């Protein structure tokens, strides 16, 4: 099914000691330069990404103008609003300085840690 790693493990302890605070996946506190540094990196990459989506919008509309067809054919126009809003939401840093998918990746990390903890626990229980 699924597993949260045991409370006493040092792997997540040091994970949070490095990254500081991640919302909803870890409660420990450490050196928080990581958090706001990643937050400012997220804001910067958001600005450059906005520039890049504007450029991709120009090239996409130029390509569509070469066809002369309404509603566009290179993109499904019903998926674009939900795609854009979801991607923008996942790039919003919270007060702790992390985006939603950074939390997603940290959750994947701790889940892999828990799987490794299962394997090691089975080995040691047999031992």
């Amino acid at each position: 099914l699924s597993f949260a790693p045991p409370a006493s493990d040092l792997s997540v302890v040091f994970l949070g000691n490095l990254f500081g605070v991640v919302d909803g996946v870890l409660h420990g506190t450490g050196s928080q330069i990581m958090g706001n540094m990643f937050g400012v990196f997220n804001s910067a990459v958001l600005a450059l990404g906005g520039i890049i989506i504007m450029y991709t919008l120009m090239v996409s509309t130029m390509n569509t103008a070469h066809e002369g067809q309404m509603l566009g054919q290179k993109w499904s126009s019903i998926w674009i609003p939900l795609r854009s809003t979801f991607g923008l939401a996942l790039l919003i840093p919270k007060a702790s300085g992390y985006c939603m998918m950074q939390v997603f990746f940290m959750w994947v990390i701790v889940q892999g840690v828990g799987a490794a903890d299962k394997i090691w626990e089975a080995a040691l229980s047999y031992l």
Binding site: F38, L46, T56, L57, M100, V108, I109, A116
Partner: protein, 141 residues
């Protein structure tokens, strides 16, 4: 008596460091992926989803496979020293003219090989700790 008992600790700490560096790399990559979400390219819900899936499964399976290699090399060390013990006594037999000093230093050299083999032997098995994960990623993709 000293290097062998600690060498697994060295290699496992370095492997865990490689894992942590991978965590940092994927953490830095995550905003790039969520920026890839907002591409106007196609209608897929992942965009450039090869990167996301590949890096995610890599970091997810890195620790379990490191433990896999750890226990595998623990099992491998004993069979390795047993290979060495089975082969050494006969592989050195004719070397043991070989009279006088030649006989003395010969003993030295055979010992200089025995533990030498030992020092390589376990070490190679322990590179197996770093051998399973990446090669596994070659299989899935």
């Amino acid at each position: 008596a000293y290097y062998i008992p600690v060498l697994p600790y060295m290699i496992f700490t370095f492997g865990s460091f490689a894992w942590l560096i991978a965590v940092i790399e994927a953490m830095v990559a995550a905003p790039i992926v969520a920026l890839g979400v907002t591409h106007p390219e196609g209608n897929e819900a992942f965009g450039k989803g090869e990167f996301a899936i590949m890096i995610l499964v890599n970091v997810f399976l890195r620790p379990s496979l490191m433990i896999i290699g750890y226990i595998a090399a623990i099992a491998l060390s004993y069979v390795g020293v047993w290979i060495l013990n089975a082969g050494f006594d006969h592989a050195i037999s004719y070397i043991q003219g070989y009279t006088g000093w030649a006989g003395v230093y010969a003993f030295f050299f055979s010992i200089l090989i025995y533990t030498s083999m030992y020092l390589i032997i376990v070490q190679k098995a322990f590179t197996l700790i770093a051998h399973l994960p990446d090669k596994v990623l070659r299989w899935i993709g």
